[model samples]
Target: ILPDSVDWREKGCVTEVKYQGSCGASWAFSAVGALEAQLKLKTGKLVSLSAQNLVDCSTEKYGNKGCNGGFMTTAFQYIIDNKGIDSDASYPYKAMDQKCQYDSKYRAATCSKYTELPYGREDVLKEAVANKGPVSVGVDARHPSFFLYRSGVYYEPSCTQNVNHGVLVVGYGDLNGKEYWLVKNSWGHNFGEEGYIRMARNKGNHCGIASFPSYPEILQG
Candidate 1:
């Protein structure tokens, strides 16, 4: 049985919050976040993988749009296809589209596969979070409340099923009678509650939290 709440950050599986700047590559951050957690869980090392590597290199055959936008699954595919990904210290984040400069020498993490949770099922999403570290999820972040979120259990009844932003669900818990998902964003630490958001959970998949949840499969050597 899963606990009522699980926090990957408390377990030291989460990396520091990152800033994507003016780029629309939140997908890369989301993907890297999950991959980083998996790598930590398996190897006992929390290496900050390069989201920039995916932003620049996952654009071609992987079908990612670089700074414009992308899908987390495609980003994982790019990493698997490339055999690995670079560390943030190596590739770094330019926050904009740039030529691919990936080098395997700087490879920080690799995943053999990724798994997607069943659609629209918070039950499955919760289980994955409890057992599989961090899971990348897509959510609708077009509302003013989301952009200006400060704290508390965020519940935007007006929010719909349109998932325009990619983020990581680090944990889930009930607070003050409100269930919330501890989500990590890529908009820097100043964006939300220290680069995280307490989004309303178990509210009919509020904002599509379970619409497209997925995570990577890191293997030990």
Candidate 2:
């Protein structure tokens, strides 16, 4: 049975929050975030992977638009095909488009596959986080309230189902009797609650958080 709450950060599975800058590389960041946690859970070492590698490299073959937009699912596929992904220290982040500079020698993590969770099932999402670490999710972040969100359980009924941005769901728990998903954003440490936000959970998939949840599967030794 799953616990009432789970926070990967408490277990040291999560890495530091990053800034996406003008680049719409949330998909890469979100995908990398999930894999980073999975890598740590499997090997007992947290390594920050390169979203810049995905930003520039995955664009052409994977259909990801560097600094424009992309999908986490495709990013995972790209990582698998490339054999592995490099660390942030190696390739680094430019926050903009550049020539693909993926080097296998600097590879820090490898994922064998990826899986998408059942559609519209927050319950399944909760269980996944409890068992598998962080998961990548797409959301409708066009709302102004989402942009200026400083803290609290964010729930905008008017927020559309048109998923536009990708984010990582790090954990889930109730905040003063209000159930919420602990979302880790890539906008920077000053974005929300230290680069995080508690989105309303078990509320019919607000912002489409559960519509297309997915995570990379790492092969354990």
Candidate 3:
């Protein structure tokens, strides 16, 4: 059974907060976040995969639109089907649309397979996270509460099922009387709790948390 409380950050399964910086590539951040966590879980190494790599190369294929936003599954598929992925320090992020610069020489991380979670099923997601690692999830960031989120269990009753942004669920827990998923955002550390958001959980996946959840199965290299 998964722990009553599990924090990937506390357990050293999470990397530092990253910022997409005015880019619409939250999908890449989330996809790489889950991949990074899976890599750590498999190899005991916390490697930061390059989200910029996906932002650049995945656009043409996999229906990704680069800085214009994309889907997590698309990014995951790109990693699995192409030149693996690079280290953030190597490819680096520019936060703007640019021509693809992925090089095989910089390939540092790779995932063999990817899987999706059942929509609106928080229990299955929780179990996946506890057993695997971080999970990439979609979010309706259009909500006012989400945009101005500061702290505590975030419950936007008006939140809907539109995926305008992507985030990584690093852990889950309860605050006060509400359950929340500890999510790591790519909006930098100045955003919520150090680039993390404790979003409402177990309420039919409020804000579409489980709408299109996914994670990578990292391959040892």
Candidate 4:
């Protein structure tokens, strides 16, 4: 697990955005979600990276289309290969679209390398503590409590929906005497306890959203 010394409070702030639940856009969300946090840390500026940019520009070659399931690394590869794109103030957010609008300006970094690890829950924590950037992971959110996670105390449930959604791993800490990881979700802030969720840091549940970490290699500059 991540070291107790890791401070999520200083690392970044949880952001809530309107995802519009577009086609398998979770991949794009997952990719840009972590980048947003990393960019904040790198530039000390919190900017909303474009999920639509990822969806429309980096599809098929980098990762899955809007609907199909794909890993975050593929999306990273797309950024590296295509030199990346920027969010569109012009194009609106939609759940599904036959076409994507790719803007040339405001493009982000082009990832050069991608890394995948099969670490368990605790291992992920260690990586987060030692690493400077954010981690991308999937969680099994099928639990009844997850569906009803409106607010207040959360109890680990035995059943889960096995929904593999992407999230950003910022830091770890203890809350109410329970060790939990600070995770950022794309689903607007109104959902879940103010757009964030806490999961057992040591316990291997929730599909281990901490299992996979995406490392980006910048294009030769």
CA error at residue 58 for candidate 3, angstroms? 0.6
What does candidate 4's lDDT look like per residue over 5-59, in tens digits? 4544465533445554646666667677666665565556665666676666666
The Cα RMSD of model 1 versus the native structure comes to 0.9
Question: Please, what are the lDDT tens digits per residue for candidate 3 over residues 1-221?
Answer: 67877799877778888988888999999999988887787878887888899998998678989998898898988888884899988998899988888898988788798899988889999999888888999999997788799888888888997678999999998876688899999888999888899988888778999888998897655
**Residue lDDT tens for model 2, 1-221:** 78888999999989999999999999999999999998998889988999999998988678888899999999999999999999998999999999989998999998899999998899999999998889999999999999999999999979866789999999999977899999999999999899999999988889999999999988864
User: What are the TM-scores, per candidate, against the unseen true structure?
Assistant: 0.98, 0.97, 0.95, 0.81
lDDT (C-alpha, whole model) for all candidates? 0.92, 0.92, 0.87, 0.61
Please report the TM-score between candidate 1 and the true structure. Answer: 0.98
Off by over 4 Å in 1: none
Q: What is the lDDT of candidate 3?
A: 0.87
Query: What lDDT would candidate 2 get against the real structure?
Result: 0.92
The lowest-lDDT stretch of 10 consecutive residues in candidate 4 is 7-16
Q: Given candidate 3, what's the lDDT at residue 112?
A: 91
